[PDB]
Design a protein around this nucleic acid. Sequence first.
RNA 1: CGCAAGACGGACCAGAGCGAAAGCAUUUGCCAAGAAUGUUUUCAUUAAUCAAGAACGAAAGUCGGAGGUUCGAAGACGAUCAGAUACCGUCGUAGUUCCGACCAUAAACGAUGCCGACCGGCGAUGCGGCGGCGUUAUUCCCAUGACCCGCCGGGCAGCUUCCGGGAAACCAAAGUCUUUGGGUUCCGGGGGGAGUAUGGUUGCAAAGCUGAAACUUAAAGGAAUUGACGGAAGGGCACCACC
RNA 2: UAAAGUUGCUGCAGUUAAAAAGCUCGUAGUUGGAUCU
Lengths: 82, 129, 218, 82, 22, 71, 132, 99, 213
Amino acid sequence: MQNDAGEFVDLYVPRKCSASNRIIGAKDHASIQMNVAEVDKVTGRFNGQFKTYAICGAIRRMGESDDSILRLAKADGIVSKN
Amino acid sequence: VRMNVLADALKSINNAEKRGKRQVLIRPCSKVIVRFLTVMMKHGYIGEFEIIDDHRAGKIVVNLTGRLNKCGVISPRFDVQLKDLEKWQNNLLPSRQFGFIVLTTSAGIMDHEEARRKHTGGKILGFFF
Amino acid sequence: EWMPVTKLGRLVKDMKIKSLEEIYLFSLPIKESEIIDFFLGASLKDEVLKIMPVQKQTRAGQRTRFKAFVAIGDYNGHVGLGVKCSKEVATAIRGAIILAKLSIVPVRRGYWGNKIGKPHTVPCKVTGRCGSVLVRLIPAPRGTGIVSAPVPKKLLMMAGIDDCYTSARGCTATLGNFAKATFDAISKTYSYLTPDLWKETVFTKSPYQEFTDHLVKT
Amino acid sequence: PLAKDLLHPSPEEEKRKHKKKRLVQSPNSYFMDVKCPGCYKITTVFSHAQTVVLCVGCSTVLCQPTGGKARLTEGCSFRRKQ
Amino acid sequence: MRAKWRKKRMRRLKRKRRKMRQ
Amino acid sequence: GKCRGLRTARKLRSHRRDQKWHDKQYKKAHLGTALKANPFGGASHAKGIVLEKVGVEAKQPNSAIRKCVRV
Amino acid sequence: GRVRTKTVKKAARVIIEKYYTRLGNDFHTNKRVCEEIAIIPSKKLRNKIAGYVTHLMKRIQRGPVRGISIKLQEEERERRDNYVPEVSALDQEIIEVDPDTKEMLKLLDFGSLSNLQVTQPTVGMNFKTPRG
Amino acid sequence: TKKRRNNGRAKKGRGHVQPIRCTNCARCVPKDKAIKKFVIRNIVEAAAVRDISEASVFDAYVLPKLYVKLHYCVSCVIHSKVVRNRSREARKDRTPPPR
Amino acid sequence: SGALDVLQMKEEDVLKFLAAGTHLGGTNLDFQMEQYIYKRKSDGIYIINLKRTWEKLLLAARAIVAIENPADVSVISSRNTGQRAVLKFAAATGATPIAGRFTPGTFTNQIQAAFREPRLLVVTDPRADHQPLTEASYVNLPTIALCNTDSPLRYVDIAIPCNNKGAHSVGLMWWMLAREVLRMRGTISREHPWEVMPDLYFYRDPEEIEKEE
RNA sequence: CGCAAGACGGACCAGAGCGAAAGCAUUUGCCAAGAAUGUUUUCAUUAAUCAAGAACGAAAGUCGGAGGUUCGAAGACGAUCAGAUACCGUCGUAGUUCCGACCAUAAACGAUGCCGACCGGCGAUGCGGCGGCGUUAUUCCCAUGACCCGCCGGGCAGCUUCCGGGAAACCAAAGUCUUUGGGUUCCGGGGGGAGUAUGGUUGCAAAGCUGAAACUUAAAGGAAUUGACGGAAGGGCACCACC
RNA sequence: UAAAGUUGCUGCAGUUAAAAAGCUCGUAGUUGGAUCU
């Protein structure tokens, strides 16, 4: 992606799955980019900001997209620990 | 029977990476397995691993960063000279930019780039990319 | 003119999708060829690889239709392949051109040795498969050209690959499977996780989210 | 699963497994001290004993071999260690 | 011809041939 | 599967040498029976004396008389 | 046979959905209104449409039919969709709870609740259908 | 090409199954492969039940039944219409007919 | 929830859950729903941990709120048990409902009258709403589902562990999802109970509507 | 009503079990063997696969000795057929049964070598073990046997497969394959000629094992798709069909 | 000779296209678990 001169020569940088760290292909139409709303610590209202998790279609098909999103939310404090 | 425990370890790591798992349990452990894993981890492919000590032959739980495409063994361990190393890299590696051949040399177990740095040929153990 | 039927088409027509790489980044499907006509435009050069007449046996005789294999792509990193079967050759060619436009994928180019200038070859060894036809692309040194059969050579030149090494196995005489395997190998270039792509992904807003207000303002 | 932890398994999940398939193998057997009304000394008896154990203080058998755990006779108190 | 019957015919040919050869 | 051992060279060599005899071209070119049955005897050309002229009928799908000579 | 084709069936459905006000139960009145409110280019087809309109009017006088979406029956159905009881069906003074769900609630930090009555667990583990 | 995964028989984990004879043709057919019908039929047909019941010496006699186990070869079972040919997908349905 | 005291589940919520029987699952257990159940009763019924249910409901509410246009959220129910609840949720929240038969090609066939391209997709039952779930894998459509113990988790990105069989439980689950979405948005507060009672979402069969009137 | 002969072991009998395969089903007793399970027992690499050699090996067949019910190659008749000396029927010889000695071949098939790792889910089932509410049986103090709900190990199977692979049919193996190397044996190289000729070797024989070539040919073949056809099924229809 | 990954060590294939020995022992051959700074 970087030549010896240091200039970037890639067409684009593809997304990587937030669970498997695998590249999501340009024609992977089963992949998702879910936004999870962030909430105020004392009011519990939408902050206008969110957190994004990209799950590829292979994880969705095998059914571990739910567990992957749950673990990503748990490891981020959106979902309460234990 | 089970021969070449390194082949089993590398096949288990490859299969667990294909399945998208975060950890793989390898058994039995061995010195060569630990050295191969250390060479893998120095290059950022595999991450930290823990050696479980049962009193007969250890097991290793290896964390898996999703960076690994394929890890394989070469059987038999052909003796490789420094002049035949380039042919092995062309046969085994996806490109000249990334990918490593792990040799076992009298200077230790290391990748082909280090083996050329230390001016040592050896016996081919495997590869990873 | 062109009245978009999809949200993505409406966003593309109202000049707020900067490049085709945003859609590739978010893996959205293209259902209107006018998006590709808008982005790649006159740089696209298509050609017909093969017109295969296929017959269906009936009581009165054989019903003949013609399948058109069309490869398209600007010679700079985008290539597509479309196959359409119709009762007539002209209709099949038009449909195959539309399908090849809809199937355009980004092609990742790399270097063989030292990284000087623009990337010229494939970033690594890639393999494409389509019904026993295996096509392998190997990085080649600068100035080698495409060392391949005419069909993979045409697809790779359309993809903008300057020089490559090729291996084929299986019944490559079936042009459709050969071309589809070459297309699969070409599209696998951007799905391959190389160490230069290990940097953690930084997410940007989707076109549907970043321009939701414009979509609802209609 | 796709993220099950193997380094720190639950204790129930390790007692569930085969003794050889555990993270560190451990027997399912144990030794017991069995008291008999006809004696006072210490008689440590293997839980899976393959022999007919006889109390030296009486004509009473302590346990009988079985396909698995030994069958302790009714009227004997056994305390398991470790 | 059925393969079993072809084999039977060949075997009868061989039987006659070994009959004539001593 | 095939044997992969550092001391399997003899087995691989002998197996290849035995399996080459199941190749039609190899058996034809190395058995020497096709050489003795060749009228030219390994030569590219030959000189003969025309015994008679013969016309051989073409194979079934098309009809003709092929002008040959028995030499 | 006397099977009505898609033409008369669809025409009757549209006529009933759009002019349910005027149509009745009599063939003659349905015939007259069908002739008035539609351009039916044949009299046999007009009569067939009017007959199926009468049949469907009898059908809908006895309940809702899926092909027609008249506004009165839709209003009645939507009114039925807003029915709300005086007291919520979930406002039970006592909720019968098994011992295991009570232990779960204890682990859920809800163990002081007095609405819950602990029921005797069923001593039979016979919950699967016999095989065969 | 393999038509059935079980090869048209019910033999797993054994080499040989004893043959039986088809009830129609007396063909030697393996017991696992053979099509078996268990017929539990009244000795007195339903048309004759009333006439036999009236002529009965004993009141409330409940007439006996017939228990005959039928073994069929594939040819005779198909011809007798006990079984029929099915589609490639419906072939896999092992549920007996609901009747 | 994020362990915030404001987003914690109250006693009233647990009362509603227990009255509706939400914690009671089925006799079968999908291997991907094992992390959501608590134990199996002596009669084979799996008990759904209401902590995990509340957590997943709040996560789904966050996901729905993150969709800027409420109409881009699609709520689906082919079963009549969740149909009226889906219409009520759409009315209260602003989502686009599909109650009844889901026409195949609704998400994939652009040349079609009832063609829509939602940004989120919520279903009452993955096993019963398998058609929209399958089509969501063609258009990059994330999916939230109400899943029982035996529900399959293919194409389900946020599974809310709950009894989706009983009418009371389905209505309560949809009502709580709507209430949490509204509370996270800002409309209606969480300091006093919501004015809409859960029974507005409950399914009423013809016998029940005839008996009540 | 009995009597006598041989043959066989129905129903129970299952996509159930055992055996290396062939194969194995009436009771009881004897003899030796065996897998799995359990084991905080012992030895401590003793192992895997295997040229050469060796044991077993359906049926039919051969040579002796018994036996010879039933069925039955050959054969003899009787039969609608244009024509059986075929299919059908009545008989019927070797065989079919047992005891020795040969024979070593089967679509001997899962048309899938063996040993070892890893890779999804679920419900069963056979065996052993472990745990547990309760229900039933031997005097009212317990195990235990039959159920019930589970866990572990081996086994016969029932599985999508967009894990994955294949030409597909399909296969949780026929996966972990151009991202190609765990170990090892056998074995194929377009179709015919041909498993033929010849040599050797085994056998009483029948035959078995090893096993060509000249010549000939552009295809043969595998999976599937549409149609056509079927003295194939299901459902309908027609006085150019019948009744 | 390359094309022939149609002799395949790299690098073929053996369910149905040609193909795994009927089965099991077995000597040579090939291969062989952890562990020493």
